[PDB]
Design a protein around this ligand. Structure first.
Ligand SMILES: *[C@@H]1O[C@H](CO)[C@@H](O[C@@H]2O[C@H](CO)[C@@H](O)[C@H](O)[C@H]2NC(C)=O)[C@H](O)[C@H]1NC(C)=O
Ligand SMILES: *[C@@H]1O[C@H](CO)[C@@H](O[C@@H]2O[C@H](CO)[C@@H](O)[C@H](O)[C@H]2NC(C)=O)[C@H](O)[C@H]1NC(C)=O
Ligand SMILES: *[C@@H]1O[C@H](CO)[C@@H](O[C@@H]2O[C@H](CO)[C@@H](O)[C@H](O)[C@H]2NC(C)=O)[C@H](O)[C@H]1NC(C)=O
Ligand SMILES: *[C@@H]1O[C@H](CO)[C@@H](O[C@@H]2O[C@H](CO)[C@@H](O)[C@H](O)[C@H]2NC(C)=O)[C@H](O)[C@H]1NC(C)=O
Ligand SMILES: *[C@@H]1O[C@H](CO)[C@@H](O[C@@H]2O[C@H](CO)[C@@H](O)[C@H](O)[C@H]2NC(C)=O)[C@H](O)[C@H]1NC(C)=O
Ligand SMILES: *[C@@H]1O[C@H](CO)[C@@H](O[C@@H]2O[C@H](CO)[C@@H](O)[C@H](O)[C@H]2NC(C)=O)[C@H](O)[C@H]1NC(C)=O
Ligand SMILES: *[C@@H]1O[C@H](CO)[C@@H](O)[C@H](O)[C@H]1NC(C)=O
Ligand SMILES: *[C@@H]1O[C@H](CO)[C@@H](O)[C@H](O)[C@H]1NC(C)=O
Ligand SMILES: *[C@@H]1O[C@H](CO)[C@@H](O)[C@H](O)[C@H]1NC(C)=O
Ligand SMILES: *[C@@H]1O[C@H](CO)[C@@H](O)[C@H](O)[C@H]1NC(C)=O
Ligand SMILES: *[C@@H]1O[C@H](CO)[C@@H](O)[C@H](O)[C@H]1NC(C)=O
Ligand SMILES: *[C@@H]1O[C@H](CO)[C@@H](O)[C@H](O)[C@H]1NC(C)=O
Ligand SMILES: *[C@@H]1O[C@H](CO)[C@@H](O)[C@H](O)[C@H]1NC(C)=O
Ligand SMILES: *[C@@H]1O[C@H](CO)[C@@H](O)[C@H](O)[C@H]1NC(C)=O
Ligand SMILES: *[C@@H]1O[C@H](CO)[C@@H](O)[C@H](O)[C@H]1NC(C)=O
Lengths: 219, 364, 462, 50, 49, 50
């Protein structure tokens, strides 16, 4: 299936406070009214320039992503996981199952079978959006958690995404996947292009509205 | 150009005196802005005040006369007008006349004209009752005085009701004043937004060329910024000269209208309104002036039939100051702008010649 | 200063802009956020049991806050050599990875842990590359590692086929073969076990007692960043023109307590026209406004040198409390050297915002110019004023009609009789033709100007 | 190497000359308005009664 | 300036808003030329015959 | 090597366009003063007697 975003995937281009100021930016955005894939419950996707990624549930079936160029050994990759404990970022050379996942006893993690040469570690319904990008050896992640009053369909509205993380890795990326918690006892993928937007800033400094300046003559 | 850095400031000395010329130009245009206001508004020697008991024949000037309980002692309509319309090396100088002083000037002009007519613009102010002044102005457009004195209450009601509509139409149009504000702000913003272009250098910051380059290599990169910033400043200064030469002509026209429509009665067509000019009133605005033009407009016309002359006793008679008209069966004389027929006598006609050379003579 | 600005010895009455006033920044400050992970070296430099010399350890220190000062000044180290980089500048640099290798050797073998050495240790136990970058630290440990009767648990390799590559490691235990005869895994002549053991004993002369060694090696692959020194932070003062740096933001100005509220990820705020006007202090996380340090032109008011040599001074739109008698505050700035009176005269020297100055009350004073004398007209509804006499008045009016006709040869101005310059000037096209055409058209207009004013009569009447 | 130094002098002097000519063109237009006003006063104040 | 080429456009992008100012200046002139003609000729309410 | 020459070409071609636009601005203010005189003549000599 395919679906239509309406006004989705707007993130704060950077720090620096700001108030009521229709500020104009050039960056990598998800164009308004786009053609976003639909997935149910998954396969190896491309990256090619950033990614929008939403998801909907009350349980937690979406348990992180895996990135990289080959998703195996012989080249390095990232791995972002969340068991019922908390997030586990990790950067080694792995050996990934071609269909990697984790179970739910509640024993799991048939994800990889190798953790060699680790160069970075870290340990510690609902709509959960994420924007992933990778520039100059930094892997930036923006995110937002809005509550839907549906269960698993893409809604309409405006909600800007706030920066979360910054990782000075150096890693090359060309592909990525997803991770799901099996049954033993809905998600979308947009892509980002270089656009020019007009963001409206509130008096507290939040982005409340935007204009995509390449949609139509009025814009 | 440099922003308090001795390296850039020494390189700048090699360009001569460009930056003394730019300042001379901007000073020359900041002095003439005060000269512009002085010649529109200081057109009085005395500050005239209006009398406490204000009976002007039924005419009511209360929405254009000063109001003490208001801000800056402005009139009620001068308020509707004032409600509708720090950087690096950039400053704004205040005007020499405050807004209070200019509202004082317009209230002195307005009390001079309500009270003395056009006499104060030629010498000492001589008072005259307001309806007799209105009758003189009717004479000046070619209507007789009895037409004012017999229609006084109607003419005063029309004037009051028409001053009441200016107040609505404004309270509910000052685009020419808004545009000059907008143009100046749009230019000042473009000037500052140029302090963040490279013009072909490694950055836009002098603390970044003075931190990752040795002095022999930072000269070449500082000069590329100096050239660009000088170009941008000089473009700003040229376009201000061209915009000031246009504001100057507008103020020169405003100074002529204050002389010819406020301190006089003009005969020039469409110079002080549309119609026949009776009188004008000034009001101050943020960076300009509003004239309220009061004119006479004729209405409700009828046709009659005319002749150029009347033949009688073998002589040809012409009207002294009117037109011969016929209501179908009888012949009268009117004045040309207002219908008021009279019997043709030897007191309102004159004779010249016999009645066979004019073409169109009638017998009467 | 006015005479110098005008380039003359006589200044006529007026008001002249003469220079500028710029408040200097008393001092400067820096700032940053508290520290958390300052790296716990107290595991590699504080271990209970070190590692052999033939199988050294290898800890890969990573993203952290490293403070090499606690190392450098600890005075407990008998040897602290730095090679790629002198020691005091370590707490001011950042790399990608730091590796720390640990082992135990004799006392007089610490001189083979250096780039470009030879000997049984550097040959085949632990080899340092020839362009090393890190530092080598070593301290005596006789009381911990040496035990009566001999501590035979610290071995080293004394035979190998070939010297090690830098940072290469070899824990094998094959029987060495010196001679040509094959060994078949049994000892004998020319078939030697390759590992020997220091028998350390507490009554050994120095140079025979165990030393513990840690080799820090800073490497810089090609990542985006990593661990580095702990950029300290100094205090912060406000309400004073200051020179500040907020973790990268370099600027100048007065700092003031704010009352805006950023979002809890925004560092600094910007204005329209894009200038930094607020910051957040990293350490305490409070918003502070940044206003520019007072500055403005300086003007000199003089009655004219042919009247007096007294002078008054206007500091334009500067608050009159921060200038460095008569100090007087105006909407146009701070005036010094003129007294404020309550009278009102006709304007003489225009200061601004309704204020003028004059040399009247032998000095200089300010006041709110007067518009004119007041006048009530005796208006009533049956009164009239009629003149009984007249005057004949004659007044003059002066108008410029014309200006001086000038021409410039564009080529002789720029080059001035030089053919080398003239041929290079041809590469710009028609600039000089344009300039001469512009200047000639306004010389033709000047004769038209005076023909239109004066030749308005057909005959010459007498 | 004479050429590289001569080009900076050419660049600076050309800009000087252009600034002079632009500011003469703006000032001649102000003199023309004055001379038109003086022509109108000559016709209306000397050759008639206004 | 550039004219088709693409090596020129990225280099000219480094000069800021010099080209936006020039287009504004020329557009103001063109809008003034119609107001000139409206002010001279459209001085009449009705079309009289 | 080419960026150096292309910047010289750009500088010259931008100077030419600024000269052109500044002169059009000065020449349009002269046409406006003439159309203003025409409007006053149409008002005062065609719609009345002067
Ligand atoms: C002149 O006109 C004004 C109206 O603008 C009159 O003043 C107002 O009259 C109304 C009606 O009685 C009152 O409700 C207001 O309080 C009056 N004052 C205001 C609006 O400020 C004024 O009375 C008229 N003058 C004469 C002499 O009749
Ligand atoms: C003056 O008389 C003329 C002549 O009849 C009137 O003009 C005509 O009016 C009728 C009705 O409005 C029209 O159908 C004709 O076309 C008009 N023109 C002619 C007949 O030539 C006119 O209305 C009269 N004016 C006044 C003020 O009464
Ligand atoms: C033209 O006007 C005259 C007014 O002088 C009208 O004639 C008079 O009309 C009144 C009232 O109808 C009579 O009392 C008079 O006797 C009339 N004659 C005179 C000499 O006054 C005449 O009717 C008008 N004609 C038209 C066509 O309206
Ligand atoms: C105006 O009056 C004169 C004199 O009363 C008229 O002149 C007479 O006209 C008649 C008829 O054409 C002649 O028979 C007489 O000989 C004329 N007398 C004189 C002294 O000229 C004249 O015709 C009248 N006009 C009109 C249009 O009736
Ligand atoms: C940074 O460290 C300072 C101390 O070094 C912290 O200041 C403490 O703030 C709390 C307020 O919650 C006070 O109760 C303590 O007494 C303060 N300590 C000292 C020594 O003054 C400061 O809070 C730290 N920064 C953050 C963001 O927590
Ligand atoms: C290893 O740990 C010890 C103990 O915590 C540290 O020894 C301290 O050194 C300082 C400075 O020489 C002394 O003031 C303290 O008295 C010592 N500790 C004790 C308990 O007395 C030592 O600095 C640590 N080593 C490193 C490299 O950090
Ligand atoms: C998205 O693209 C696919 C490509 O074939 C197309 O079939 C589909 O209709 C598109 N969806 C929308 C909403 O345009
Ligand atoms: C969650 O997964 C991470 C991945 O390595 C693991 O380190 C952690 O121990 C897991 N949680 C628990 C409770 O084991
Ligand atoms: C990565 O792992 C492989 C196999 O474990 C090893 O051969 C290689 O040396 C490792 N990379 C580095 C830089 O040591
Ligand atoms: C990423 O892959 C490209 C393949 O074209 C390669 O040239 C590049 O060096 C890689 N990135 C890094 C940081 O090596
Ligand atoms: C945030 O914005 C709202 C509306 O714009 C305002 O009422 C509020 O005071 C602001 N600040 C908060 C909620 O802290
Ligand atoms: C007016 O024209 C009529 C034609 O209808 C003619 O008979 C008459 O003589 C003319 N009169 C004048 C004064 O022109
Ligand atoms: C200037 O000086 C001369 C002679 O010293 C004197 O006659 C003249 O009055 C002075 N001018 C003024 C304005 O004081
Ligand atoms: C100058 O600073 C003082 C101290 O805050 C203040 O009281 C005064 O109002 C300031 N000047 C002006 C013109 O406001
Ligand atoms: C001017 O008059 C005011 C009246 O309010 C008075 O307070 C003030 O002291 C006077 N100034 C001088 C210098 O006398």
């Amino acid at each position: 299936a395919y679906t239509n975003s309406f006004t989705r995937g707007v993130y704060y281009p950077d720090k620096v406070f700001r108030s009521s100021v229709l500020h104009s930016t050039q960056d990598l955005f998800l164009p308004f009214f786009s053609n976003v894939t639909w997935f149910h419950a998954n396969p190896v996707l491309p990256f090619n320039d950033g990614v929008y990624f939403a998801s909907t549930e009350k349980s937690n079936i979406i348990r992180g992503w895996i990135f990289g160029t080959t998703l195996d050994s012989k080249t390095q990759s990232l791995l972002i996981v969340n068991n019922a404990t908390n997030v586990v970022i990790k950067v080694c050379e792995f050996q990934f199952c071609n269909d990697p996942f984790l179970g739910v006893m509640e024993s799991e993690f048939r994800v990889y079978s190798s953790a060699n040469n680790c160069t970075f570690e870290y340990v510690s319904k609902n709509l959960r959006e994420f924007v992933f990008k990778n520039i100059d050896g930094y892997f930036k992640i923006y995110s937002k958690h809005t509550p839907i009053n549906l269960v698993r369909d893409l809604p309409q509205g405006f909600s800007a995404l706030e920066p979360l993380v910054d990782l000075p890795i150096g890693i090359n990326i060309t592909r990525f996947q997803t991770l799901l918690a099996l049954h033993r006892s809905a998600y979308y993928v947009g892509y980002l292009q270089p656009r020019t937007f007009l963001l409206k800033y509130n008096e507290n400094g939040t982005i409340t509205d935007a204009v995509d300046c390449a949609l139509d003559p009025l814009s | 150009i440099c922003g308090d850095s001795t390296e850039c400031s020494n390189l700048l000395l090699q360009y001569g005196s460009f930056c003394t010329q730019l300042n001379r130009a901007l000073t020359g245009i900041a002095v003439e802005q005060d000269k512009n206001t002085q010649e529109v508004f200081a057109q009085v020697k005395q500050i005239y005040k209006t009398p406490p008991i204000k009976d002007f024949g039924g005419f009511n000037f209360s929405q254009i006369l000063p109001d003490p309980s208001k801000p800056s002692k402005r009139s009620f309509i001068e308020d509707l007008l004032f409600n509708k319309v720090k950087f690096n090396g950039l400053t704004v100088l205040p005007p020499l006349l405050t807004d209070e002083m200019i509202a004082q000037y317009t209230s002195a002009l307005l009390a001079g004209t309500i009270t003395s007519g056009w006499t104060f613009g030629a010498g000492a102010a001589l008072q005259i009752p307001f309806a007799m002044q209105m009758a003189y102005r009717f004479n000046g457009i070619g209507v007789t005085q009895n037409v004012l004195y017999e229609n006084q209450k109607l003419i005063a009601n029309q004037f009051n009701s028409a001053i009441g509509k200016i107040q609505d139409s404004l309270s509910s149009a000052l685009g020419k004043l808004q545009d000059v504000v907008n143009q100046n702000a749009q230019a000042l913003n473009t000037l500052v937004k140029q302090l963040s272009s490279n013009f072909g250098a490694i950055s836009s910051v002098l603390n970044d060329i003075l931190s990752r380059l040795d002095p022999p290599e930072a000269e070449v990169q500082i000069d590329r910024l100096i050239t660009g910033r000088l170009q941008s400043l000089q473009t700003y200064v040229t376009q201000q000269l061209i915009r000031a030469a246009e504001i100057r002509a507008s103020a020169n026209l405003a100074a002529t209208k204050m002389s010819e429509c406020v301190l006089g009665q003009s005969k020039r067509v469409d110079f002080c309104g549309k119609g026949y000019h009776l009188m004008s009133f000034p009001q101050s605005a943020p960076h300009g002036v509003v004239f309220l033009h009061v004119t006479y407009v004729p209405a409700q016309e009828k046709n009659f039939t005319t002749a150029p002359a009347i033949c009688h006793d073998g002589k040809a008679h012409f009207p002294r100051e009117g037109v011969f008209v016929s209501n179908g069966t009888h012949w009268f004389v009117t004045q040309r702008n207002f219908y008021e027929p009279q019997i043709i006598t030897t007191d309102n006609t004159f004779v010249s010649g016999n009645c066979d050379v004019v073409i169109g003579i009638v017998n009467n | 200063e006015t005479k110098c600005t005008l380039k003359s010895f006589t200044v006529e009455k007026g008001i002249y802009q003469t220079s500028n006033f710029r408040v200097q920044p008393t001092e400067s400050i820096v700032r940053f956020p508290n520290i958390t992970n300052l790296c716990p070296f107290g595991e590699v430099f504080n271990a209970t049991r070190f590692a052999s010399v033939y199988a050294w350890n290898r800890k890969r220190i990573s993203n952290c806050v490293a403070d090499y000062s606690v190392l450098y000044n600890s005075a407990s180290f008998s040897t602290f050599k730095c090679y790629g980089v002198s020691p005091t500048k370590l707490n001011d640099l950042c790399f990608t990875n730091v590796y720390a290798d640990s082992f135990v050797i004799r006392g007089d073998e610490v001189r083979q842990i250096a780039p470009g050495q030879t000997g049984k240790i550097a040959d085949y136990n632990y080899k340092l590359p020839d362009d090393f970058t890190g530092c080598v630290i070593a301290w005596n440990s006789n009381n911990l590692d040496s035990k009566v009767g001999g501590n035979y648990n610290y071995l080293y390799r004394l035979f190998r086929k070939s010297n090690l590559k830098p940072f290469e490691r070899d824990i094998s235990t094959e029987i060495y073969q010196a001679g040509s005869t094959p060994c078949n895994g049994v000892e004998g002549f020319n078939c030697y076990f390759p590992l020997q053991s220091y028998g350390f004993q507490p009554t050994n002369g120095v140079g025979y007692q165990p030393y513990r060694v840690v080799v820090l090696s800073f490497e810089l692959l090609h990542a985006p960043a990593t661990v580095c020194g702990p950029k300290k932070s100094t205090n912060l003062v406000k309400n004073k023109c200051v020179n500040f740096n907020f973790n990268g933001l370099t600027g100048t100005g007065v700092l003031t307590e704010s009352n805006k509220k950023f979002l809890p990820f925004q560092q600094f705020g910007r204005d329209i026209a894009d200038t930094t006007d607020a910051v957040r202090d990293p350490q305490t996380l409070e918003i502070l406004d940044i206003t520019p340090c007072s500055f403005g032109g300086v003007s000199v008011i003089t009655p004219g040198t042919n009247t007096s040599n007294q002078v008054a001074v206007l500091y334009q739109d500067v608050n009159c409390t921060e200038v460095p008698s008569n100090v007087f505050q105006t909407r146009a700035g701070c005036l010094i050297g003129a007294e404020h009176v309550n009278n009102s005269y006709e304007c003489d020297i225009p200061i601004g915002a309704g204020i003028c100055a004059s040399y009247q009350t032998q000095s200089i004073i300010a006041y709110t110019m007067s518009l004119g004398a007041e006048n009530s007209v005796a208006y009533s509804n049956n009164s009239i004023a009629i003149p009984t006499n007249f005057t004949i008045s004659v007044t003059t009016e002066i108008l410029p009609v014309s200006m001086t006709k000038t021409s410039v040869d564009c080529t002789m101005y720029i080059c001035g009789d030089s053919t080398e310059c003239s041929n290079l000037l041809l590469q710009y096209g028609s600039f000089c033709t344009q300039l001469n055409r512009a200047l000639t058209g306004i010389a033709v207009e000047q004769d038209k100007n005076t023909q239109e004013v004066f030749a308005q009569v057909k005959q010459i009447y007498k």
